[PDB]
Amino acid sequence: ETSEGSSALAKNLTPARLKASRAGVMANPSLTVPKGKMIPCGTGTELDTTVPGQVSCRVSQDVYSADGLVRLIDKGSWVDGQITGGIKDGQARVFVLWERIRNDQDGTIVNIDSAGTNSLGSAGIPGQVDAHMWERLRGAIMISLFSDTLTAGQLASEALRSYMSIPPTLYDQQGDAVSIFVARDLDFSGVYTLADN
Amino acid sequence: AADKKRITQKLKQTAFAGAKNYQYVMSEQPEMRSIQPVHVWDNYRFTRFEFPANAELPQVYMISASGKETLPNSHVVGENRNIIEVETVAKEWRIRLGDKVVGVRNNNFAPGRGAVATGTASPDVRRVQI
């Protein structure tokens, strides 16, 4: 039995204290591709979000280590990834999970488990939308055309329901220029080392 | 042996072996120069698309016997990772990056020539069933 108003106010004056954070240092900056770097890619497989499945791309240009000094992700490498869901109306791009980079000269493999992007870094691969309007409308259209040729509330509301049951789908041509946002530090320490010359 | 695996591997790493064909032509559109190849040639087995050393790698597609543009298999060769060695041969190709495209035509497509029955890319190394 202390006042409820009073308690509500006291509670609102009690913040969640955030923990301070300690800086550290990255262990192998010359042998790590760190979060946030971009892997420019060209898609091998065409893409069509009608049925969930897989995608590939080949790295378009070399990607260097955290300090810019060592070439780590080699131009020419193949990346395999998956597109496991589709798009919704109001979307013209789709989430892409890029899984592994494989250097075919060398055999170096790394699971990057990172999200595909535009060339300019924004999320998901842009594509061309097919809204499937006709297929989403033909039932109602056909039916009402009789109802009308009977001119010679709930149908419409049923129509819209049916209209929403089928999604638009996204397409993107083969060979598209596209990119990958490295989500997690990629450590090449166990695979590459340095020597002169 | 580990040393045997190494010799066979090096030996093999050498065959794009064989009579060569250089008889290739391409569309020439100035908007598409940025992905044009410097060389295209083949072995009658594998086809090489060579790009300037520091150029961005575009992607390559073949026109199949079916008439359809098709995604082939391919690996890159060279110190500069600038040559795409497609693991096949074809009458016709497309080179693509984004909306850029270059058509490449093979003027001496001779399927029937150049096969090796070795089980590998090389005349000198053979695949053996254990």
Binding site: - | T14, V25, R48
Partner: peptide, 24 residues
Amino acid sequence: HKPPPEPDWSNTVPVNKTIPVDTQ
């Protein structure tokens, strides 16, 4: 969906201005 562009062949040109070499 509109497919990717097709080349224009009006001007077709040899690829190899010089003979390539296999450095392996």
